Symmetry: C5
Subunit: 216 residues, 5 copies
């Protein structure tokens, strides 16, 4: 029953932390040129569900791991009962506007929109998604298989406000559905920097390239 009090105190500690972080000097306005952010992206490809040769749309199911770090989300665990991290609704915090650049339907969200914040200010958010995107599956019924590609990146921030990185250029296939209609030959995820004549600012994306064929 002291165990009850210790539990009540841990709750108090976490609630205070959250109120201190979110309400005390409130909602972080997103990155700027004077305060840029790096977002790390990683894909875990679960399934190629559908490949439509009449419209050249392919549907993927994946988890997209997003990580970034804000000084405004830092705290000292010692001031809050040694709390080192917490789960919070993604609506409680700023999240990056990472967007598939060649989708053909709105992304469908398959996982709860909850993120983990750690005491150093780092945030991890892993939305599971079903995505329809522009892909010609010609060759999928061959040994060579088909190849498609889709870029992901911020919609509204240039490379001067949001930089992107990957930890590896290999997509995680370790949870790929073993009985999919389609087998994966390769899946890569590569940071690209784009440059345009009009504009001094660079544009950054991550190119997801998947080669696949009908599983015999």
């Amino acid at each position: 029953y002291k165990d009850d009090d210790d539990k009540l105190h841990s709750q108090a500690n976490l609630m205070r932390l959250k109120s201190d972080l979110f309400n005390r000097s409130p909602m972080y306005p997103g990155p700027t040129k004077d305060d840029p952010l790096t977002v790390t992206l990683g894909f875990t490809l679960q399934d190629i569900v559908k490949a439509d040769s009449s419209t050249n749309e392919v549907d993927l199911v994946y988890y997209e791991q997003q990580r970034w770090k804000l000084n405004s989300l830092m705290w000292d665990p010692n001031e809050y009962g040694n709390i080192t991290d917490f789960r919070t609704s993604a609506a409680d915090i700023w999240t990056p506007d990472i967007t598939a650049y060649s989708s053909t339907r709105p992304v469908q969200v398959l996982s709860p929109q909850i993120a983990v914040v750690t005491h150093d200010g780092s945030v991890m958010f892993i939305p599971a998604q079903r995505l329809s995107f522009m892909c010609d599956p010609t060759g999928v019924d061959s040994e060579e298989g088909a190849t498609c590609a889709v870029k992901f990146g911020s919609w509204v921030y240039s490379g001067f406000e949001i930089d992107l990185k990957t930890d590896t250029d290999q997509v995680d296939l370790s949870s790929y559905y073993a009985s999919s209609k389609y087998e994966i030959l390769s899946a890569t995820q590569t940071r690209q920097v784009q440059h345009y004549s009009c504009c001094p600012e660079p544009y950054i994306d991550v190119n997801l390239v998947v080669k696949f064929r009908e599983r015999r």
Copy 2:
């Protein structure tokens, strides 16, 4: 009688106010929670062999208990439980790990809270998930599986359990296109390379065949 009813309303409204808008940041490693899960399988509606997706309709019973939802019935005119919008309370982020479409909710999002702090919530859902129905048109049938668990909490914050490993088939639709050969619901613990925390899921395994 009408005045006694007026009284009972007042005590209920006061209980809800005392519990909700005068007193929870979810579970933690120091304040962990156990969620009991149980499935009642109503129908295998569709098995798509062109995409390897199967669609189920089930009721998913969720149960957990919070100290912060306890009260003494004697303080509130002998109220021992109440119904409330699921939005009024914390609910667990129990998620199918291999869904291919967002879950469609078929029932009112209302839970029952009991004076001991226990909550029961039973959403009816339609789920599309990853499943190769090959063999469904044979005597042996097809076998598929989908894991449910928290998306964001490890076993250090949320544990899971089932009251039985037998999925409840007593409301399975008798004229479904597919008959159920077996349905099981099993707590599993995953231990990892990366991480020291255990991860818990319940594995729903369905063996079925064309009726």
Copy 3:
């Protein structure tokens, strides 16, 4: 014009007095409620033999009465009833027990409150539910059934009743792909070994065949 303004003020006042003043948390064992249900079947839209789902369009009349919603007309300029958004009041969680898709709502979610505290709410719905249409292409036709009832309240908090066991077919679409041979709506009471309470539903049973 002044008197139309007064009738507006009476109604605004009644509504504020009932809603933003007075505290109804739904029915309880000590303050139970009876919901009357009646169905008007408009169309069997689709019958899918590949998945055994059938799609209906109907109006579901719901009626109940709360003391907390009554008033004296003479205190409010002889107002005897009013239309209000269904979000302004408590409504029952009447649910189809064997749907396969979320219900699609076809009508405005507005109810009528009467001075004796009675409420009428008639949602028009399209429902997909579990139904094997085998026989639909035969003289005998097909038969399907779907139960409706509270999701969360047992018979000790919400009782159900019908005014008749005949589904209203007077608005059934004459050029539907399916002709209705019969449609009934019947109150049922069940027990489950889990639980000591009675459970109540209204069973909608439709017998139909392909129009010739």
Copy 4:
């Protein structure tokens, strides 16, 4: 000019605050009935499904009514004679198709125009699926279908309906639709039902159509 438009902006803001607060309207009643004028502009018969007997129309429905509680004197507000407003800011009539098979899909912004005499105009564009047997659409005489529109919850004692014409506006009908329009009418009907002593009013939209040739 910058200051004049600062004023114009302030005056409109004031008008709206003065109207949507300051006696904030519970809809029509038998003592304070309302007439809603309806008219249809049929743009396209998109789809005719003979497997389920549902047909899909695209149209604009012009709705007009007048409330004294939305009147003002333009001279008190910088000669503002009308304004655009979110439909969520005002009362709107619950005009409903009585034989839809799916929820209506809204194709236009839900914004209305209010004029200083209290009159409102709202023109929602809609895609509607309704109960229609397309048998005969592949013939010279075509198919005929109908759908009634009216209030869901108010009788003719609270909301009366009217049309300005019984001819549906076909001047924006898509010329390369799969279906040609042979006729389209919109007719106010009064109905009486055994249940109830009060009159019920609808507008019957009747469309005669065939496959384009």
Copy 5:
């Protein structure tokens, strides 16, 4: 650095609070305070052409640009901030609408706009649109031609004017492996008067000529 980033954050948070609260909701354009919206299309894909219903499905980015005096500030007064990103829900946006859609537009990008210190706003929603279009001849060298008008649903030319910076649709991002190739795409401002009404009506007519890729 942490304290300088704090001041920068503080300057923005204060700008966003001075603009939004403090002279709140702009009630939209009026005859006395009219607005010009510049529109441009970047056509990415013709996804589908349905000849059983005469609907065609397009994916494009629609660039919208307008300027409000109520959104201006002096950068010198706010730590030299010259622009910011904001939720499109934080601001007034124009009710620009396709006049012959057959289904609600599906939004494919974040609803976030960029506000610049001169009071200008840029908003670039990505959309999938189904519209009225007979694709007959798409399987021929001459191809099919369709057209859809874009404009305010509720404001006339007296409140909202429209303009294009160019009559050529941007095809530099058109999907190279689409089922349909683009023969041409133009975006043309049109002024109409109708006998009902004295006000001018303005729209931008998107005209796409296309055929099956071979």
